[PDB]
Amino acid sequence: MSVSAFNRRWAAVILEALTRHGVRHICIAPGSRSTPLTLAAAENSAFIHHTHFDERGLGHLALGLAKVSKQPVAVIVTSGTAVANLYPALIEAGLTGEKLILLTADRPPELIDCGANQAIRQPGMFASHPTHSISLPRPTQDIPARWLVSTIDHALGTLHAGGVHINCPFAEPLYGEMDDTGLSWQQRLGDWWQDDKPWLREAPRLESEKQRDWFFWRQKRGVVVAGRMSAEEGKKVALWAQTLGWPLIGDVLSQTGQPLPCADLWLGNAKATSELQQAQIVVQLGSSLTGKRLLQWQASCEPEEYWIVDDIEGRLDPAHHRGRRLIANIADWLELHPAEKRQPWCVEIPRLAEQAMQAVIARRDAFGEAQLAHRICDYLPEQGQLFVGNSLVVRLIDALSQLPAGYPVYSNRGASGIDGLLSTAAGVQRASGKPTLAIVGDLSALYDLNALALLRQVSAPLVLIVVNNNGGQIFSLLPTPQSERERFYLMPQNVHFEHAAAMFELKYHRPQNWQELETAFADAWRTPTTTVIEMVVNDTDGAQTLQQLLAQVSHL
Amino acid sequence: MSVSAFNRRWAAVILEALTRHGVRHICIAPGSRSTPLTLAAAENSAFIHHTHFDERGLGHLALGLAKVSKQPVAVIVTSGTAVANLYPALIEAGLTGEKLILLTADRPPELIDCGANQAIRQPGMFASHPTHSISLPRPTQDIPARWLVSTIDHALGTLHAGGVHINCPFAEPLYGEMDDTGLSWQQRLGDWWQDDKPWLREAPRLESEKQRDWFFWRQKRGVVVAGRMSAEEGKKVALWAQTLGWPLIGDVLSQTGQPLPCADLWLGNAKATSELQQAQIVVQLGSSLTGKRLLQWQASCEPEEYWIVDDIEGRLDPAHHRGRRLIANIADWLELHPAEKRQPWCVEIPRLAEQAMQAVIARRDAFGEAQLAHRICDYLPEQGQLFVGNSLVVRLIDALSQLPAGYPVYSNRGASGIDGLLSTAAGVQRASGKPTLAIVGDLSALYDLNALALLRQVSAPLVLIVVNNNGGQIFSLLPTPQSERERFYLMPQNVHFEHAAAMFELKYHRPQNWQELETAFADAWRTPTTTVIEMVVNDTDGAQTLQQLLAQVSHL
Ligand SMILES: Cc1ncc(C[n+]2c([C@@H](O)CCC(=O)O)sc(CCOP(=O)(O)OP(=O)(O)O)c2C)c(N)n1
Ligand SMILES: Cc1ncc(C[n+]2c([C@@H](O)CCC(=O)O)sc(CCOP(=O)(O)OP(=O)(O)O)c2C)c(N)n1
Ligand SMILES: [Mn+2]
Ligand SMILES: [Mn+2]
């Protein structure tokens, strides 16, 4: 009888189904059409609920929660452009593997393509970007509940990685007190309601087999390249490479401890590339390599075989080497392909790497973003985590700093968007409950400005450093044309962030030197709140310092 | 020879072609991959160039420019999530007809699906929402320029309404001096380069035929419903209905002068709906009707025929009446189907409409948002335009005010998103150069908060009223459940906007009464700048006032 009640019973099956697949966090934006999902979510004691008014930020909040928790995270939005705003986070999840379950409320079929308010064509609107797409039918008791839960169970069970789009049409009436409509329909699932398992368990695992000729290849002159991986994996890779006696090129995202630091500099030295030409195999673990010199060396090197080990699917070598693409958990893969103690074969590169780091240390004093990057390991929160933004900061830390082995680093380096860094950082913090250092540029902070609202609720101190070099100064590093560079590339906005912090009642510091910066950090880590630290620097100093250090090390 | 040079020659053909189809405005966001497009655009003197750092706002800026200018507007963004951020404005354009030309830079095919930075699958990523989608091939001189310009001319030439997605892959190198690579390839177009017309002229017109039985139907008892249309159209429709003697129900978006105002109130009176039961034909011009009582009357009425005249395509009647869907320019359609002077047939409704307005007038004094809506006609800038936001404000103005005939009203009421209202208003202002009054709610202002950067550049005064009722109070009008209402619907953010204005160096007022509001208005219209006026009101007063006035008029 009651459409509004059955709507909520239908939605209740969807949300309860998700709890059987480890969904704990659910992120909700406001709306009317989403009522059945949102009320079902509110009533379900399994969930931790997060809310936000910007669906683009909401998507990135979910991304950050999923990134850290390694759990699928659900999102509820209403029909219309609210759904479209999830696209950026969905795309990034597609690339880096976060499991985002997007429950998107829709108008019923009778209200599509007839000029109805807030009604658009939603099925398939994210194209190939979701791993799974489910277009649910118009709710009816004539479709059994066992079908509905089975469909959700299939999507979640077979999900190796990435996003799921679950489009959810509901007809009005949406409101009214609940009667018993749909109760007997729900009760057809029997004691599944009191169970802790899915209705349908479908969970095939995707994994490459052991390479049986590894014991042959590990005897050769190899190189280990470490890309993005977990903090624990980084430590394991570091020990493994050391035992092999193979040089380890470690990305800022690797948490390997970077035993040959400043690779973006010493890879620019012909003596290094000459030595690396002796490598017969490269084993890369993880992906999304950061540095330009590393990506250039990757593109140029011609080992007999190039292997990439990672737990995400598809090709990961943009230079298309002859070799192997091995899908595996990195820690597991290392146990299957163990190192045996062997004499190191590289002689020149350790020397060069030490000289490179010394060159950077020689320039540590100036109060600039290159120096902040270089020294960032002095400001990492104890037992905390680092969220690095995109553009120059990730490149400068990668080139100029040596981050501690096993110290957790998080980022959005799939598509490397500057559109969701603050809201992602909020999710990263909330998921782990750890003190968090996040560092972003000024255009990045502006892009996701309203995410400062989310940063008013963190469970441990979060320091947000905004490096303000007045524009996108990556375009001063790149060889952009001088005539058009300022108006069409850099796009300086000539703002500061003191009033933004004040608007959201966040503590704010604008340190003018290292002493004030250290005092600001000392102040910030004291309370479970977000502190904004704006570091104002001269526009092109960071880019020019990198260029100068590159030139200096290349002549070593 | 030079890939960087040819990239720019290929892009130059694309941008020059657009100038032959009335594209004057181009909106550009920063990136490296977009370099060929962006430099080609920068070099082309036909364009007015706009920039912004948030691509979602950039899309809405373009939407606003197109909305007012009635010409196609181009957009350039780089590859990755930048592209995804254009979705909301593209969807809105699909519904209300703005011609947005989206030039989205892409990686070349060899860098897709191989773990390359900022490379995603872009062709088809907007699904069915663009009117036309072009996936350009990897640039090569082996494809003649005449094909490239012809393909663009086909897309723009046959564009009745809505967006065009032009995906533009470019391979590196992107930078480098221009040599003569591609010059002879371009010159194959001969003196087209000096012409003012397209290479291929393909411009069929889409239009319904004259209704040959109109002289029969115009003598029947009809009702005219006026939805969204141009300001000039509003005036013509008002005169046309008056001549026919048919009652005119005029939307806030119609600019008809609303001769039977407060329709959202008096349509709730059974005596009005009883009189309307005599209507044998309803002729609706324009669409996207605003008010609940009007949408409910539309759904319940059963005239012999229901006609909708509008210049956008497809079904526009969400109640699916037996009738006609007539595609035409509204002014042209009225000339093709002229009115005959006939005696008005409605007697009861004019009485009710007068009584309804008196009821609202009785409550004009309180300093609340309902009163602001009612009185807004008294505060319109001379020779200006109104941009009305979504949620309560558009509904309160529609229900409670009588806007002057022919006074331009602009809005985003296709999908009615609250995600781009400030940036749209910025585009609306820049397109017309007129003094602009924009009114939005607090969550709306937060959603598009960084668009205040754009409002730093207006060519005439813009007053931005932010109605702060601490949350989405439309969900206090809707029968949402009380227990979950605050956390999961209203989502109060408990902020003010004084610091937001200050951040972007915009004048700010927080008036405490009408005198102070009028003083703020007086100061604001004096300079070509944006003034922020924050009206802080009691959260649920506006909703409750509307509810009470509805009840009051229903009992007349
Ligand atoms: C949503 C979107 N849209 C546009 C872009 C293009 N884009 C970039 C990519 O080229 C960098 C990808 C990467 O890190 O590899 S970096 C950049 C400027 C950032 O300025 P900033 O925050 O002040 O920092 P700074 O440059 O260090 O001064 C832009 C605008 C994007 N990435 N995402
Ligand atoms: C991008 C997106 N995402 C979510 C929504 C859902 N949604 C609405 C639709 O229900 C209203 C469509 C309409 O106007 O017809 S209104 C609304 C809250 C607005 O709060 P406010 O600005 O403070 O104004 P107030 O309510 O008067 O206090 C939301 C969140 C949306 N529209 N667009
Ligand atoms: Mn910057
Ligand atoms: Mn509000």
Side-chain angles (χ1 to χ4, degrees), chain A residues 1-176 178-350 352-353 355-481 483-556, chain B residues 1-176 178-204 206-211 213-514 516-556:
Chain A
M1 62 169 285
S2 174
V3 162
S4 71
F6 185 69
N7 282 344
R8 287 171 65 176
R9 302 263 180 197
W10 177 272
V13 174
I14 296 166
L15 280 162
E16 180 61 19
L18 296 181
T19 72
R20 311 301 172 86
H21 299 276
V23 176
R24 298 299 175 254
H25 297 279
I26 187 162
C27 301
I28 298 168
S32 184
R33 192 57 52 149
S34 43
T35 281
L37 298 166
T38 289
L39 296 186
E43 292 169 10
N44 196 316
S45 59
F47 300 122
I48 305 169
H49 314 85
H50 313 267
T51 64
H52 194 40
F53 52 80
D54 182 326
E55 281 93 11
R56 183 182 64 200
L58 190 81
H60 284 103
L61 174 67
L63 182 73
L65 290 163
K67 195 187 298 288
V68 174
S69 69
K70 299 296 181 206
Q71 303 165 349
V73 170
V75 179
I76 293 170
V77 302
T78 195
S79 73
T81 58
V83 183
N85 271 274
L86 298 176
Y87 215 175
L90 176 70
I91 290 165
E92 178 71 11
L95 296 170
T96 54
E98 287 85 347
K99 295 178 177 186
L100 299 185
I101 317 305
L102 311 185
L103 310 175
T104 65
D106 201 356
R107 268 54 184 170
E110 67 266 22
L111 282 173
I112 306 304
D113 290 345
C114 62
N117 186 51
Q118 204 179 315
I120 69 172
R121 296 183 297 275
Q122 296 192 180
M125 73 180 286
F126 298 131
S128 70
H129 288 283
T131 299
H132 290 311
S133 300
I134 304 171
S135 305
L136 291 181
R138 197 180 190 281
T140 170
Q141 306 209 6
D142 291 326
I143 296 171
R146 58 177 181 278
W147 173 86
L148 184 56
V149 62
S150 293
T151 300
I152 295 158
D153 281 347
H154 166 75
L156 266 291
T158 62
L159 187 62
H160 179 82
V164 177
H165 181 204
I166 307 185
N167 195 61
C168 301
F170 296 102
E172 315 158 41
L174 301 164
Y175 301 103
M178 283 216 53
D179 66 10
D180 284 346
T181 303
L183 180 62
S184 59
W185 177 88
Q186 281 182 332
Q187 286 168 335
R188 291 286 294 126
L189 300 182
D191 64 16
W192 172 86
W193 287 100
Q194 290 75 46
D195 196 3
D196 62 351
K197 307 181 292 292
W199 176 265
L200 179 70
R201 287 173 268 169
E202 183 188 2
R205 303 293 165 181
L206 183 68
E207 194 182 12
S208 291
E209 294 182 76
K210 292 186 304 179
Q211 303 300 286
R212 287 186 291 268
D213 58 349
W214 165 242
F215 296 106
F216 171 82
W217 281 106
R218 70 179 184 177
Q219 291 182 261
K220 303 287 147 191
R221 289 181 309 271
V223 175
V224 184
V225 175
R228 179 189 52 238
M229 58 187 69
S230 79
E232 287 296 339
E233 282 160 359
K235 292 193 280 180
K236 292 173 181 189
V237 166
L239 180 59
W240 182 82
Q242 188 189 16
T243 299
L244 291 173
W246 296 0
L248 174 53
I249 304 174
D251 202 82
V252 60
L253 306 183
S254 70
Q255 303 125 146
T256 52
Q258 296 173 298
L260 298 167
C262 305
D264 191 54
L265 304 183
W266 59 256
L267 277 169
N269 192 288
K271 295 182 191 61
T273 49
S274 297
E275 187 163 63
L276 288 177
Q277 287 186 337
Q278 301 172 335
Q280 307 164 269
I281 180 172
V282 178
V283 173
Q284 169 181 326
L285 303 333
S287 51
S288 290
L289 307 179
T290 300
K292 179 173 182 190
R293 257 57 58 185
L294 175 49
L295 288 165
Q296 284 183 320
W297 174 77
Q298 182 190 248
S300 74
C301 74
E302 274 169 35
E304 284 190 49
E305 295 201 10
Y306 199 103
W307 301 6
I308 295 182
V309 183
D310 210 346
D311 51 22
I312 58 172
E313 301 173 59
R315 299 197 297 110
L316 291 175
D317 179 7
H320 320 296
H321 288 91
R322 190 181 183 178
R324 313 183 198 194
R325 175 62 255 281
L326 304 170
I327 291 69
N329 172 272
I330 287 171
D332 293 347
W333 193 89
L334 294 176
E335 291 187 354
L336 288 186
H337 305 83
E340 194 180 50
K341 217 311 154 165
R342 196 175 313 269
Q343 179 77 23
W345 63 269
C346 274
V347 298
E348 295 292 320
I349 287 175
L352 284 173
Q355 286 174 289
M357 177 56 81
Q358 289 169 356
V360 181
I361 292 170
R363 305 194 57 172
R364 74 188 298 277
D365 291 314
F367 195 64
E369 59 179 318
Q371 288 78 17
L372 175 65
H374 165 62
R375 302 173 183 218
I376 206 60
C377 43
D378 300 339
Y379 305 114
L380 298 173
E382 292 287 331
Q383 299 302 112
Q385 59 201 8
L386 175 69
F387 183 82
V388 293
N390 291 324
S391 211
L392 282 181
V393 61
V394 66
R395 288 165 173 82
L396 291 172
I397 294 177
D398 180 73
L400 307 179
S401 198
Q402 183 178 44
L403 297 186
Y407 194 96
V409 176
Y410 298 102
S411 68
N412 289 347
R413 299 290 304 162
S416 297
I418 58 157
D419 50 324
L421 297 170
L422 291 202
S423 47
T424 302
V428 163
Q429 195 291 311
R430 292 185 188 181
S432 66
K434 291 177 173 175
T436 304
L437 175 57
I439 314 172
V440 308
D442 51 291
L443 295 190
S444 298
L446 284 172
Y447 209 131
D448 205 16
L449 190 63
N450 67 29
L452 288 171
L454 291 170
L455 292 172
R456 300 177 295 178
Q457 298 194 15
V458 291
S459 57
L462 187 149
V463 173
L464 175 64
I465 299 180
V466 179
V467 177
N468 194 347
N469 54 20
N470 203 24
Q473 294 298 336
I474 190 159
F475 299 114
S476 287
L477 182 63
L478 291 164
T480 59
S483 171
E484 291 78 26
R485 178 179 308 188
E486 186 183 317
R487 182 175 185 198
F488 294 99
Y489 289 84
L490 299 176
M491 303 197 182
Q493 301 295 307
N494 292 292
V495 293
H496 292 292
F497 292 84
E498 183 171 8
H499 287 291
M503 173 170 180
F504 295 100
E505 290 172 314
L506 304 176
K507 288 195 300 164
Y508 173 88
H509 303 273
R510 185 187 310 188
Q512 298 187 36
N513 57 52
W514 295 114
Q515 285 155 304
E516 291 184 6
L517 180 59
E518 285 172 20
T519 299
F521 274 110
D523 179 15
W525 297 124
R526 300 186 295 132
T527 65
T529 55
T530 293
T531 298
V532 179
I533 301 181
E534 184 175 356
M535 197 190 174
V536 183
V537 305
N538 298 318
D539 47 14
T540 63
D541 285 358
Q544 289 192 8
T545 297
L546 180 58
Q547 288 171 318
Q548 289 163 9
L549 282 164
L550 290 167
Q552 182 182 2
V553 172
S554 79
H555 288 130
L556 293 175
Chain B
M1 178 157 60
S2 175
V3 164
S4 67
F6 188 68
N7 284 346
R8 285 169 64 174
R9 302 264 181 198
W10 178 272
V13 172
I14 295 165
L15 281 162
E16 180 62 18
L18 296 181
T19 73
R20 312 300 172 87
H21 298 273
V23 178
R24 167 170 202 183
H25 296 278
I26 190 162
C27 302
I28 302 169
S32 185
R33 191 57 52 149
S34 43
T35 281
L37 297 166
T38 289
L39 296 185
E43 290 167 8
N44 194 317
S45 59
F47 298 122
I48 302 171
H49 312 85
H50 310 269
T51 64
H52 193 39
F53 53 81
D54 180 327
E55 280 97 13
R56 183 182 64 200
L58 190 81
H60 286 105
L61 175 66
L63 182 75
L65 291 163
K67 194 186 295 286
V68 170
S69 67
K70 296 295 181 73
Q71 299 291 334
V73 171
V75 178
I76 293 166
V77 301
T78 193
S79 76
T81 57
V83 181
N85 271 276
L86 299 176
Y87 218 169
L90 175 71
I91 289 164
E92 178 74 12
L95 296 171
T96 53
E98 287 86 349
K99 295 177 178 186
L100 300 188
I101 316 304
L102 310 183
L103 308 173
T104 65
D106 200 357
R107 268 54 182 171
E110 68 267 24
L111 284 173
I112 306 305
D113 289 344
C114 60
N117 187 51
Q118 204 178 315
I120 66 172
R121 296 184 299 275
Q122 296 189 179
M125 73 179 284
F126 296 129
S128 69
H129 289 284
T131 297
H132 293 149
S133 300
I134 305 171
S135 181
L136 291 180
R138 195 180 190 278
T140 171
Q141 299 204 35
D142 291 325
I143 295 173
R146 59 177 182 279
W147 173 85
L148 181 56
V149 62
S150 293
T151 301
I152 304 295
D153 283 345
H154 168 74
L156 267 62
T158 63
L159 185 64
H160 180 83
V164 179
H165 181 205
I166 308 185
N167 196 63
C168 302
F170 296 100
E172 312 157 47
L174 300 166
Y175 301 104
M178 281 296 307
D179 66 11
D180 283 348
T181 303
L183 182 63
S184 60
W185 178 87
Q186 282 182 332
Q187 288 167 336
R188 293 294 297 127
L189 300 184
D191 64 17
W192 171 86
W193 287 99
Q194 288 76 47
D195 195 7
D196 58 350
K197 304 173 204 156
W199 177 266
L200 176 68
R201 289 174 269 169
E202 181 186 3
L206 182 68
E207 197 180 12
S208 292
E209 295 181 12
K210 174 187 290 189
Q211 299 300 289
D213 58 350
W214 166 240
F215 284 12
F216 171 83
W217 282 107
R218 70 180 183 179
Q219 288 186 340
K220 301 287 149 190
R221 288 180 308 271
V223 174
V224 181
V225 179
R228 180 189 53 237
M229 58 187 69
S230 80
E232 286 292 337
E233 285 162 0
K235 290 190 280 180
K236 295 172 184 276
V237 167
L239 293 179
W240 185 83
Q242 189 188 16
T243 296
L244 288 173
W246 296 359
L248 174 55
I249 305 174
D251 200 82
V252 54
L253 306 183
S254 70
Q255 303 122 152
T256 52
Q258 296 173 299
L260 297 169
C262 306
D264 194 58
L265 305 181
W266 61 254
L267 278 170
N269 191 289
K271 297 182 192 62
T273 50
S274 296
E275 187 163 64
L276 287 175
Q277 288 183 28
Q278 303 173 264
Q280 310 167 273
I281 177 175
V282 178
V283 176
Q284 171 179 327
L285 301 105
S287 52
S288 290
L289 306 179
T290 300
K292 179 173 183 190
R293 258 57 58 187
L294 176 52
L295 288 167
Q296 286 183 319
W297 174 77
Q298 181 188 60
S300 74
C301 75
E302 274 167 34
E304 176 167 350
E305 295 201 10
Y306 200 108
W307 303 8
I308 294 181
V309 181
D310 208 344
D311 205 11
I312 55 173
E313 303 171 62
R315 299 196 298 111
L316 289 175
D317 176 7
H320 323 297
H321 291 92
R322 190 179 183 178
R324 311 183 197 194
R325 176 63 256 279
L326 304 169
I327 291 69
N329 171 273
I330 288 172
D332 293 347
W333 193 89
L334 295 176
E335 290 185 353
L336 198 58
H337 307 85
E340 184 185 45
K341 280 168 215 277
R342 299 190 59 81
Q343 179 75 22
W345 62 270
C346 275
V347 163
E348 301 293 346
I349 281 175
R351 302 185 62 190
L352 284 173
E354 182 193 12
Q355 287 175 2
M357 178 57 80
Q358 290 171 357
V360 178
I361 288 169
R363 306 194 56 169
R364 78 187 301 279
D365 290 312
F367 195 64
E369 58 179 317
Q371 288 78 16
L372 176 64
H374 168 62
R375 301 167 56 148
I376 205 60
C377 45
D378 301 341
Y379 301 136
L380 301 174
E382 185 182 341
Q383 299 302 336
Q385 58 201 8
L386 173 68
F387 184 86
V388 55
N390 289 321
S391 211
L392 282 182
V393 64
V394 68
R395 288 164 174 81
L396 291 169
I397 296 178
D398 178 73
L400 305 181
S401 198
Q402 181 179 44
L403 299 186
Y407 193 95
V409 178
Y410 297 102
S411 68
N412 288 347
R413 301 290 306 164
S416 297
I418 61 158
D419 50 325
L421 295 171
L422 293 201
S423 46
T424 302
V428 162
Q429 196 292 311
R430 293 184 189 181
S432 64
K434 291 178 171 54
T436 300
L437 173 58
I439 313 172
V440 305
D442 52 292
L443 295 192
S444 299
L446 282 171
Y447 209 135
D448 206 15
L449 188 64
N450 64 26
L452 289 172
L454 291 170
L455 291 171
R456 297 142 104 198
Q457 297 193 13
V458 288
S459 58
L462 186 151
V463 172
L464 175 64
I465 297 179
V466 178
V467 175
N468 194 347
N469 53 18
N470 204 26
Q473 294 300 336
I474 194 159
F475 302 117
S476 288
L477 181 63
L478 292 164
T480 56
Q482 181 174 349
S483 173
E484 292 79 26
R485 179 179 306 191
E486 184 186 316
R487 181 174 185 194
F488 294 100
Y489 289 84
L490 299 177
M491 303 200 182
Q493 300 295 307
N494 290 292
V495 71
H496 292 293
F497 291 83
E498 184 171 9
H499 287 290
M503 173 168 181
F504 297 98
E505 292 170 315
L506 304 177
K507 290 192 300 163
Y508 173 88
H509 301 275
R510 187 188 313 188
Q512 302 301 102
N513 55 50
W514 295 112
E516 292 188 7
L517 181 61
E518 285 175 19
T519 294
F521 276 142
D523 180 50
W525 298 125
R526 299 187 35 151
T527 64
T529 56
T530 292
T531 299
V532 174
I533 305 180
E534 181 176 356
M535 194 192 175
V536 180
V537 300
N538 297 319
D539 46 16
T540 61
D541 284 356
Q544 290 191 9
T545 297
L546 179 55
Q547 289 172 318
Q548 290 161 10
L549 282 166
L550 189 68
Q552 180 182 1
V553 175
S554 79
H555 287 131
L556 294 177

